[PDB]
Design a protein around this ligand. Structure first.
Ligand SMILES: O=c1[nH]c(=O)c2nc[nH]c2[nH]1
Ligand SMILES: O=c1[nH]c(=O)c2nc[nH]c2[nH]1
Lengths: 153, 153
């Protein structure tokens, strides 16, 4: 029994008037996102000098194609994750030398392009090791259920 | 196409040397956790005066049973989510009048017990509305895949 199943068990015993079934799927969803970010993905980003969220900025710029420059709005719309503090992240990346602000565009530098080209290869190998417990069918199955849940919001 | 599928499409076109398939399931996992916390669960907690993470503390204490008092270590082990800043959350909850520090235990006050008894009922109704796009079988299916992924870590 994991955190979520144990908690549901305690709730059934303590508040029998309650149907706490929904707590398992949502508790596991949030714990999986947290543990994977904290223990797997972010330590790899930090090996590359990237704080959480900064990889996404560079990745979005890189995969938009040459000249790897987007408006801050397009950067938010094309991000993998709709996380905030985008102005702070661009500022940090600029002082680090990986993006520059042109005209108003945010663009990879040569150094930033080189970094993300390196980091994305390490990132996808890391992701496959994160998902290796699930078979290919289970991974597609999990992607489909997550897409339905997301659209339901 | 969602954020994740669109990003994978751009990657296949820009770095054909890369297999970016893993990005869909993990991108959807993190976006679903984020959107559900930000747009669904946390606004409900804030209706009750609870910041993100504080509900979990009260919920853990309440479901441990009378006298609703745990060591800070037990509080971390029994939490639904292994999130940090537990000392800060206990401090906040203490100044708010919902927990007290006894002997070293953290315990619900009368006011804190009443609050969590009210909030947990609202919380589970909110969770069912969050999950309503998925059928009962899909929800169990999603809980099983998430459990396998978590154990794989
Ligand atoms: O293109 C991307 N792929 C990812 O896996 C990712 N994670 C955060 N930001 C990201 N961008
Ligand atoms: O018992 C609990 N049930 C939940 O759904 C939850 N979410 C955060 N913390 C929680 N504790």
């Amino acid at each position: 029994m994991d955190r979520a199943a144990h908690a549901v068990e305690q709730w059934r015993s303590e508040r029998p008037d309650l149907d706490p079934s929904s707590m398992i799927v949502l508790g596991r969803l949030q714990e999986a996102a947290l543990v994977i970010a904290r223990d797997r993905l972010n330590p790899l980003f930090a090996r590359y000098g990237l704080q959480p969220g900064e990889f996404d900025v560079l990745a979005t710029l890189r995969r938009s194609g040459a000249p790897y420059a987007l408006t801050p709005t397009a950067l938010y719309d094309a991000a993998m994750i709709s996380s905030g503090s985008m102005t702070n992240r661009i500022d940090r990346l600029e002082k680090a030398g990986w993006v520059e602000r042109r005209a108003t565009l945010v663009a990879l530098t040569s150094a930033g392009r080189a970094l993300i080209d390196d980091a994305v290869v390490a990132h996808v190998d890391n992701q496959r090791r994160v998902l290796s417990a699930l078979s290919a069918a289970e991974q597609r199955q999990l992607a489909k259920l997550l897409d339905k849940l997301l659209q339901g919001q």
